[PDB]
Amino acid sequence: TSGWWNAGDVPAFDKRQLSRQLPLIRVDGNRFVDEQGNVQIFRGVSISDPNKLAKDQHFNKKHFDVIRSWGTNVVRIPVHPSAWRERGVKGYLELLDQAITWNNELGMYTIIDWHSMGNLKSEMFQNSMYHTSKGETFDFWRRVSERYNGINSVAFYEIFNEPTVFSGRLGIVSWAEWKAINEEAITIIQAHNPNAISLVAGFNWAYDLREAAANPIERNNVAYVSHPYPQKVGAPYQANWERDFGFMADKYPVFATEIGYQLASDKGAHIPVIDDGSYGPRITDYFAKKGISWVAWVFDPDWSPQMIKSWDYEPTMQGEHFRKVMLKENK
């Protein structure tokens, strides 16, 4: 009844709620630019899933006001397919609309993240809450690409959070096969939304871009994603990062849509996200050296790693660092 293959023929988005049109962003070669052709670099945060926020009773304007006050110029919205299903299409878009509305009005760009994890082709996922299908995935991008067409704020469409085969535990898929799937998704998006930028990821949990570099997505307005957590590789960091994903910044824009860190003693700490604290400056500075946009993980006191300690919105260690950089370099 509520699932993706029974449209409750869904009312259009009411754009009377919006007062504000941010500059149109496009991919020119290896960077993002505006109408004037000035380079733009995004530095922001992921919220938790709006579904969680609404239950936690903090799906309100104040929440977004704070995010803005940290100097944030982009907000990533991790739409879990299980939450898409829990609320149903109609009920999820009501949330997603409102989030985008707040983002827009506060002068923040929006990334729409279909937040899955694993091997879509073989339908094997890390965990039930990421479970989806090719059908569902395509349907999602059809609805949102159209719904938010013409809203420059909503610039970035991130196809699939973290692709991985988990060393065979989640089966097999070639980069060639994945390229084909991203190509279809992007054709769908572009057919509904000519101006949409698509964010495409490789394997090892959206870390590798060497396969992508060798056989790139044949579509316009594409940038490539990497999630270089502290412990994805060891020292020497910058050399390793450059080899694995950094070099791709020379050629296409790179949007690191998930980074973060915490101490081992902090809440929910787990590989590959544990660090003494030095990774924060190291990664910020490497990304400055390379012109790479990035999104810190996670404006939530519960999900790990936390950028805030409670709903009093006090920064954690990683919160501190990313805030300082966003305030200095953005707005």
TrEMBL record:
<dbReference type="GO" id="GO:0008810">
    <property type="term" value="F:cellulase activity"/>
</dbReference>
<dbReference type="Pfam" id="PF00150">
    <property type="entry name" value="Cellulase"/>
</dbReference>
<dbReference type="InterPro" id="IPR001547">
    <property type="entry name" value="Glyco_hydro_5"/>
</dbReference>
<feature type="domain" description="Glycoside hydrolase family 5">
    <location>
        <begin position="34"/>
        <end position="300"/>
    </location>
</feature>
<dbReference type="GO" id="GO:0000272">
    <property type="term" value="P:polysaccharide catabolic process"/>
</dbReference>
<comment type="similarity">
    <text>Belongs to the glycosyl hydrolase 5 (cellulase A) family.</text>
</comment>
<keyword id="KW-0732">Signal</keyword>
<protein>
    <submittedName>
        <fullName>Cellulase, putative, cel5C</fullName>
        <ecNumber>3.2.1.4</ecNumber>
    </submittedName>
</protein>
<keyword id="KW-0378">Hydrolase</keyword>
<keyword id="KW-0326">Glycosidase</keyword>
<dbReference type="InterPro" id="IPR017853">
    <property type="entry name" value="GH"/>
</dbReference>
